[PDB]
Amino acid sequence: ERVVIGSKPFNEQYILANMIAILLEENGYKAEVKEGLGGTLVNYEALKRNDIQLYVEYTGTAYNVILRKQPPELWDQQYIFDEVKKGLLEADGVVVAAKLGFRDDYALAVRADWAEENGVEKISDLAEFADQLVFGSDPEFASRPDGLPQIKKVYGFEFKEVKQMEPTLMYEAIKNKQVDVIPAYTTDSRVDLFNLKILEDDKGALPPYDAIIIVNGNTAKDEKLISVLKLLEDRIDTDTMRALNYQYDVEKKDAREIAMSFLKEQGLVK
Ligand SMILES: C[N+]1(C)CCC[C@H]1C(=O)O
Ligand SMILES: [Zn+2]
Numbered sequence: 001e002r003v004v005i006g007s008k009p010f011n012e013q014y015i016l017a018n019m020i021a022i023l024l025e026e027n028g029y030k031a032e033v034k035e036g037l038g039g040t041l042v043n044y045e046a047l048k049r050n051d052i053q054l055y056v057e058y059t060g061t062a063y064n065v066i067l068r069k070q071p072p073e074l075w076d077q078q079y080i081f082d083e084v085k086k087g088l089l090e091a092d093g094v095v096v097a098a099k100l101g102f103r104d105d106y107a108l109a110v111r112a113d114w115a116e117e118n119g120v121e122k123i124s125d126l127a128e129f130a131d132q133l134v135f136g137s138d139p140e141f142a143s144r145p146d147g148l149p150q151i152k153k154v155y156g157f158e159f160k161e162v163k164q165m166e167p168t169l170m171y172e173a174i175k176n177k178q179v180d181v182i183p184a185y186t187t188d189s190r191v192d193l194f195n196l197k198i199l200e201d202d203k204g205a206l207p208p209y210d211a212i213i214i215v216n217g218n219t220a221k222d223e224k225l226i227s228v229l230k231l232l233e234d235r236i237d238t239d240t241m242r243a244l245n246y247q248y249d250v251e252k253k254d255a256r257e258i259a260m261s262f263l264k265e266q267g268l269v270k
């Protein structure tokens with residue numbers, strides 16, 4: 001069988017898509033990573049129509065963006081998981097094959113020297129300044145229901161200007177003062193490297209984003225394939241994902257080679 005794996009445009013998507021490809025290839029499959037489709041909704045549409053067979057999604061995204069479910073009073077990681085697994089199955093036959101073992105959350109970040117000068121530590125501290133700050137979005141956060149609309153609704157403010165750019169460009173943009181705030185990805189060590197400060201989400205606006213492998217209904221009938229995917233259950237924690245991402249964004253290593261090195265070290269390929 002030919003297995004096509006989707007990807008959103010950033011480090012860990014490339015790495016994990018290649019890591020899954022390698023594992024599937026080791027178990028008799030022909031696997032390929034498909035790049036360039038776009039973001040969340042284009043990948044999920046492609047999965048439903050069988051253009052792709054699986055990709056790496058996140059619980060909070062599936063809940064808010066795909067299932068368009070209503071935020072509960074308090075975010076609970078396992079509740080959101082349980083409802084995404086039920087909800088994806090009920091709606092489109094999509095199966096949650098595995099939990100990878102890490103969260104990659106959106107977290108609002110600013111420059112650390114500015115934050116220290118202004119006593120900013122939490123998102124609600126931004127209220128004073130927000131209408132004078134430029135927001136640098138990735139392709140999705142500005143328009144997603146759990147993005148800037150959710151910050152507006154929960155915290156009661158909007159930024160002065162919104163610019164959108166591909167995910168990896170956010171970190172240099174804020175460092176170089178092209179923007180003042182970004183929805184940094186928490187598995188990206190460029191937050192520390194470029195002297196940025198992640199702010200506490202003190203009013204609990206944003207959900208947990210636990211990485212999960214999702215598979216379309218027809219592909220999931222393949223029990224051998226599902227069981228290869230489950231070899232990765234809980235195997236990748238946040239510090240591991242961050243290390244691998246660094247090898248991609250800073251060391252400029254090829255995603256296939258980063259994945260291959262990890263699989264060998266963990267004994268998943270000999
Ligand atoms: C992983 N996230 C929740 C944070 C980074 C991009 C977004 C998503 O891919 O849904
Ligand atoms: Zn003002």
Ligand SMILES: [Zn+2]
Binds near residue numbers: 099233234
């Ligand atoms: Zn588990």
Ligand SMILES: [Zn+2]
Binds near residue numbers: 237238239240
């Ligand atoms: Zn670890």
Ligand SMILES: [Zn+2]
Binds near residue numbers: 264269
């Ligand atoms: Zn070896």
